[PDB]
Amino acid sequence: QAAQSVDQLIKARGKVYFGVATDQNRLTTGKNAAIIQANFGQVTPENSMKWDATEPSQGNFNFAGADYLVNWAQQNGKLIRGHTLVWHSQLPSWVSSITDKNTLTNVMKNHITTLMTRYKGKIRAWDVVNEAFNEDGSLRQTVFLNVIGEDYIPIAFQTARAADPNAKLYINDYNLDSASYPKTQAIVNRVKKWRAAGVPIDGIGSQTHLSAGQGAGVLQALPLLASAGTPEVAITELDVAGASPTDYVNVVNACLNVSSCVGITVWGVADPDSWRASTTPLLFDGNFNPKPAYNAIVQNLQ
C-alpha cells in the first residue's frame, strides 16, 4: 500500500475513480487486497465476468467468481465496471458454432440480461461490446456480426439499457491511442451515428494497452474520442511496456484534460501478475511496492 492514494488524489481533481483489474485469485493472495483498499476506488473483474467464465454451457451460469468480486467491492466501498458482455474472445464454442440468426440473437440477449439483472443497480458501467473494430475502422468479423448482422450492436445496447438503466453502457476497444489512426476516427464516427439512431451508448472505453512512448498521443486521441458526444469516456485497461513515468503521466493528463473522462483503470496491481508481466507494465513491482510511475502520477495529481 502506497502512502498516497491515486484514487483519493484523482477524486481531489474532480474525477470519479482510479481503479484496477482484479478477481478472487488476486484478492486472496499477496498484498493486492490491501493495496486496492488503500489506493484504488474501483475494480474491474479481470476475467470472472467474461462469457467463458459466466456461461460455459448455455443457460448453465457460473457466478461464483463474479459474485466474489462484486461482494468484495461492495464490502470495501469500491465501484465496479462489468466486463464484458459481447466479445469474440474467451467465447465458448457453443456460442461461436451457432449459425442461426434468431438463436444467436436470443442467446446474446439472454447472456446480457442475465448478468446485468443479477447485479442490477450495483454496477457503474458495463463494457457491453468489446473489440468490435478492425484496425482499419471496419467492423470485426465475429460470429455476432456474421450471424446477427450490423444490428448486433444496436440490439446489444438496447438490451443492456433495458436490463439495468443505471449502468453506463460502454463500447470498449484498444488502439484508440492516436488521433491519426483509422480505428480511433472510425469508432467516433460510428458512435455518433449509433447514438443518433437511438442506440444507448453512454461511454467509449479506451483500453490503452501501450508500448513504450505511446502515452504522448493519448493527449490528442482522448479528446477525439470525447468528440463523439458520449456522456463518458474512460481509460479502461491501462498498462505500458516499461512503465515509464512519462507514458503514465501523459495518460493521466489526457484524462484530466477531458471533462467527460470519468476515470482510469490500470490492468492489474503488481508487475508479475500482469497479462504482459515480462514487460513490467504496471504501477507496483514484484515486492508490491509502488514504482516510479506510481509516484509520478501521485505528484502530478497533487
UniProtKB/Swiss-Prot annotation:
Protein name (Swiss-Prot/TrEMBL): Endo-1,4-beta-xylanase
Name of the coding gene: XYNA
GO biological-process terms attached to the record: xylan catabolic process
Residues annotated with Pyrrolidone carboxylic acid modification: Q1
Pfam families named in the record: Glyco_hydro_10 (PF00331)
Lineage of producing organism: Eukaryota, Fungi, Dikarya, Ascomycota, Pezizomycotina
SMART domains tied to this protein: Glyco_10
Disulfide bridge map: C255-C261
Domain GH10: 3-300
EC number: 3.2.1.8
Catalytic activity as recorded in UniProt: Endohydrolysis of (1->4)-beta-D-xylosidic linkages in xylans
